[PDB]
Design a protein around this motif. Structure first.
Motif, PDB file in Angstrom:
ATOM      1  N   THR A  47     -50.562  27.401  99.214  1.00  0.00           N
ATOM      2  CA  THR A  47     -49.702  27.877  98.143  1.00  0.00           C
ATOM      3  C   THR A  47     -48.611  26.868  97.853  1.00  0.00           C
ATOM      4  OG1 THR A  47     -48.184  29.173  99.575  1.00  0.00           O
ATOM      5  CG2 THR A  47     -50.136  30.281  98.907  1.00  0.00           C
ATOM      6  N   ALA A  48     -48.005  27.043  96.694  1.00  0.00           N
ATOM      7  CA  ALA A  48     -46.866  26.261  96.292  1.00  0.00           C
ATOM      8  C   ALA A  48     -46.095  26.997  95.211  1.00  0.00           C
ATOM      9  CB  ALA A  48     -47.309  24.903  95.793  1.00  0.00           C
ATOM     10  N   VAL A  49     -44.848  26.568  95.020  1.00  0.00           N
ATOM     11  CA  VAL A  49     -43.952  27.097  94.007  1.00  0.00           C
ATOM     12  C   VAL A  49     -43.458  25.914  93.190  1.00  0.00           C
ATOM     13  CG1 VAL A  49     -41.871  28.373  93.482  1.00  0.00           C
ATOM     14  CG2 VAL A  49     -43.214  29.008  95.510  1.00  0.00           C
ATOM     15  N   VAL A  50     -43.470  26.061  91.868  1.00  0.00           N
ATOM     16  CA  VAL A  50     -42.926  25.084  90.942  1.00  0.00           C
ATOM     17  C   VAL A  50     -42.032  25.809  89.966  1.00  0.00           C
ATOM     18  CG1 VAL A  50     -44.769  23.372  91.078  1.00  0.00           C
ATOM     19  CG2 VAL A  50     -45.001  25.261  89.413  1.00  0.00           C
ATOM     20  N   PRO A  51     -41.080  25.103  89.362  1.00  0.00           N
ATOM     21  CA  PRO A  51     -40.300  25.688  88.275  1.00  0.00           C
ATOM     22  C   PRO A  51     -41.123  25.803  86.989  1.00  0.00           C
ATOM     23  CG  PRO A  51     -39.737  23.401  88.502  1.00  0.00           C
ATOM     24  CD  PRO A  51     -40.737  23.690  89.599  1.00  0.00           C
ATOM     25  N   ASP A  52     -40.526  26.471  86.005  1.00  0.00           N
ATOM     26  CA  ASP A  52     -41.089  26.618  84.666  1.00  0.00           C
ATOM     27  C   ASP A  52     -40.910  25.317  83.886  1.00  0.00           C
ATOM     28  OD1 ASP A  52     -41.762  29.601  84.536  1.00  0.00           O
ATOM     29  OD2 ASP A  52     -39.701  29.706  85.171  1.00  0.00           O
ATOM     30  N   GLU A  53     -41.672  24.306  84.300  1.00  0.00           N
ATOM     31  CA  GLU A  53     -41.603  22.944  83.752  1.00  0.00           C
ATOM     32  C   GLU A  53     -43.028  22.462  83.595  1.00  0.00           C
ATOM     33  OE1 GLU A  53     -39.070  20.437  86.142  1.00  0.00           O
ATOM     34  OE2 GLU A  53     -37.428  21.916  86.146  1.00  0.00           O
ATOM     35  N   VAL A  54     -43.418  22.160  82.356  1.00  0.00           N
ATOM     36  CA  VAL A  54     -44.802  21.797  82.088  1.00  0.00           C
ATOM     37  C   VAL A  54     -45.255  20.627  82.956  1.00  0.00           C
ATOM     38  CG1 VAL A  54     -46.384  20.796  80.367  1.00  0.00           C
ATOM     39  CG2 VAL A  54     -44.969  22.709  79.828  1.00  0.00           C
ATOM     40  N   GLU A  55     -44.446  19.588  83.091  1.00  0.00           N
ATOM     41  CA  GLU A  55     -44.916  18.416  83.852  1.00  0.00           C
ATOM     42  C   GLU A  55     -45.160  18.760  85.321  1.00  0.00           C
ATOM     43  OE1 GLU A  55     -45.955  15.463  82.475  1.00  0.00           O
ATOM     44  OE2 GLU A  55     -45.503  16.419  80.549  1.00  0.00           O
ATOM     45  N   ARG A  56     -44.321  19.607  85.908  1.00  0.00           N
ATOM     46  CA  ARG A  56     -44.454  19.967  87.323  1.00  0.00           C
ATOM     47  C   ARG A  56     -45.734  20.780  87.529  1.00  0.00           C
ATOM     48  NH1 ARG A  56     -45.025  19.436  90.742  1.00  0.00           N
ATOM     49  NH2 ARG A  56     -43.889  20.096  92.634  1.00  0.00           N
ATOM     50  N   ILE A  57     -45.995  21.690  86.602  1.00  0.00           N
ATOM     51  CA  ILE A  57     -47.167  22.536  86.656  1.00  0.00           C
ATOM     52  C   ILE A  57     -48.422  21.688  86.495  1.00  0.00           C
ATOM     53  CG2 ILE A  57     -48.386  24.451  85.619  1.00  0.00           C
ATOM     54  CD1 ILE A  57     -45.498  25.387  84.531  1.00  0.00           C
ATOM     55  N   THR A  87     -46.536  28.121  81.324  1.00  0.00           N
ATOM     56  CA  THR A  87     -47.728  27.958  82.150  1.00  0.00           C
ATOM     57  C   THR A  87     -48.985  27.780  81.354  1.00  0.00           C
ATOM     58  OG1 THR A  87     -46.645  29.138  83.942  1.00  0.00           O
ATOM     59  CG2 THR A  87     -48.976  28.832  84.136  1.00  0.00           C
ATOM     60  N   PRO A  88     -49.223  28.575  80.307  1.00  0.00           N
ATOM     61  CA  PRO A  88     -50.459  28.360  79.551  1.00  0.00           C
ATOM     62  C   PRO A  88     -50.559  27.001  78.910  1.00  0.00           C
ATOM     63  CG  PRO A  88     -49.562  30.540  79.156  1.00  0.00           C
ATOM     64  CD  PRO A  88     -48.466  29.743  79.795  1.00  0.00           C
ATOM     65  N   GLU A  89     -49.450  26.491  78.419  1.00  0.00           N
ATOM     66  CA  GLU A  89     -49.431  25.186  77.738  1.00  0.00           C
ATOM     67  C   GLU A  89     -49.752  24.069  78.742  1.00  0.00           C
ATOM     68  OE1 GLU A  89     -48.473  27.986  75.255  1.00  0.00           O
ATOM     69  OE2 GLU A  89     -47.098  27.681  76.946  1.00  0.00           O
ATOM     70  N   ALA A  90     -49.197  24.130  79.944  1.00  0.00           N
ATOM     71  CA  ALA A  90     -49.531  23.172  80.991  1.00  0.00           C
ATOM     72  C   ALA A  90     -51.006  23.278  81.342  1.00  0.00           C
ATOM     73  CB  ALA A  90     -48.679  23.439  82.229  1.00  0.00           C
TER      74      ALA A  90
END
Ligand SMILES: Nc1nc2c(c(=O)[nH]1)N[C@H]1C(S)=C(S)[C@@H](COP(=O)(O)O)O[C@H]1N2
Ligand SMILES: Nc1nc2c(c(=O)[nH]1)N[C@H]1C(S)=C(S)[C@@H](COP(=O)(O)O)O[C@H]1N2
Ligand SMILES: Nc1nc2c(c(=O)[nH]1)N[C@H]1C(S)=C(S)[C@@H](COP(=O)(O)O)O[C@H]1N2
Ligand SMILES: [Cu+]
Ligand SMILES: [Cu+]
Ligand SMILES: [Cu+]
Lengths: 161, 161, 161
Positions: A47-57, A87-90
């Motif tokens: 598992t992992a956690v990322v912020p609401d950031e397209v590049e990170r996702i 998330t969908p856009e990433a």
């Protein structure tokens, strides 16, 4: 290791900043584990956690697909209508082949539970031999979405290999 | 002004040319008005008519989103299978984030009324803080599509802000 | 000739290599023929087989639409989750205007029969005055998908002209 390697990505500014715990992630792991045999031998290995950031996702979805050889990636959260829900856009940027029937079933079954299901903008598709599915961030949502998928998800995983 | 500013775009060569009246527009205004409280305080503040021309449609959707600060844009017509039905294509060019669950609910509920619902190619999505939803040009269609959305549309509008 | 010219493309490495017969194609022809009047006067005037190769699929879809003046193209197969299933990707490249309601109805009705319907990634849309619809390669699938479309498909064909 398992027949199918599953990884769960929690997408949340709040969790990523250490402002709250992850309540969705554990529910997703529990649903996958408890369905391991129905899924053809799946285990959550990461598992992992990322912020609401397209590049990170994008970066984690690419790494898990291209380098770490995950078979199934479930993302949790960031599918709604707020400006930070990306998330969908990433996901659409990283997938190669769209899988709209999975989205159809999740929506169809989720709407039976709550009309707010229509506010999920989840995407899904295949990159390489990795299936990527966006689920909502509500803990109850993952269980409901997985139940909707479970009748065919084992065969999806067989086919992508 | 209202909590949510709604604008209605009738897309029709016929109406735009002055060859017939607008029969869809008034029905859309009436449904929004009569649902104003269920929608969180929405009011239709503007209407317009454009021909079945992608550039004309794009230009008004961009102006209403970027300059005039509309919160919800409903388009009416131009979603079918004829060569001149180009509303979805214009819409897909201007939206930034797709909202497929709204399309799902509209289709699901519309099919209960008529199989000809399958001929709607409506698109929907968010640009900035403006939600844009294509509806069919049949006057009865707008009421049916809005009823399908109404259980969650207030929350969609809250979230986009 | 018929009011509507229908062409059926079987997409299959196996059939194309002469490793097995076409079992889907004949079922598709039979369903169209037996529904000719419900479809407004449709006749299958041409079939072909191509391998699971995007360029081969694109080329025939373009030829049949642009040169041979087909009105309806049904493709069979190559819509699933295996690496060689590329029919939707070829289709999305050639269509000009998407027709998601047809996909919705096919999925909705197919799910009533089997949960494995969710594994179809079929696309559909219009190029010029040609409607293109992907169906699954299972022989039983085409009949089920056509039954789902038949209530409105005649009107789709009328409109595209
Ligand atoms: N099955 C299911 N789907 C669901 C829900 C749920 O409780 N169950 N919650 C909804 C709500 S309340 C919204 S706002 C969207 C988006 O959630 P997200 O932004 O957390 O991803 O998912 C929807 N989808
Ligand atoms: N709810 C609803 N949806 C509907 C209808 C309707 O009467 N009610 N009419 C249909 C018809 S008859 C077609 S041709 C398409 C497209 O219409 P449009 O081109 O006017 O936008 O919408 C369909 N969607
Ligand atoms: N109506 C209908 N849809 C269906 C089926 C079917 O038997 N009936 N078979 C499914 C199966 S088993 C899969 S794997 C996908 C994709 O098939 P394809 O790769 O042959 O195109 O279609 C699905 N869609
Ligand atoms: Cu919500
Ligand atoms: Cu119609
Ligand atoms: Cu299958």
């Amino acid at each position: 290791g398992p027949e199918y390697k599953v990884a769960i990505l929690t997408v949340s500014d709040t969790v990523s900043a250490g402002a709250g715990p992850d309540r969705s992630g554990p529910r997703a792991v529990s649903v996958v584990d408890s369905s391991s045999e129905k899924l053809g031998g799946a285990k959550v290995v990461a598992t992992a956690v990322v912020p609401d950031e397209v590049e990170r996702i994008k970066d984690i979805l690419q790494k898990w697909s291209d380098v770490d050889e995950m078979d199934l990636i479930l993302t949790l959260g960031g599918t709604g209508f707020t400006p930070r829900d990306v998330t969908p856009e990433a996901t659409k940027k990283v997938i190669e082949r769209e899988t709209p029937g999975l989205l159809f079933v999740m929506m169809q079954e989720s709407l039976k539970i709550t009309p707010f299901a229509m506010l999920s903008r989840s995407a899904a598709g295949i990159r390489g031999s990795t299936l990527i599915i966006n689920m909502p961030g509500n803990p109850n949502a993952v269980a409901e979405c997985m139940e909707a998928l479970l009748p065919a998800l084992k065969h999806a995983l067989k086919q992508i290999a």
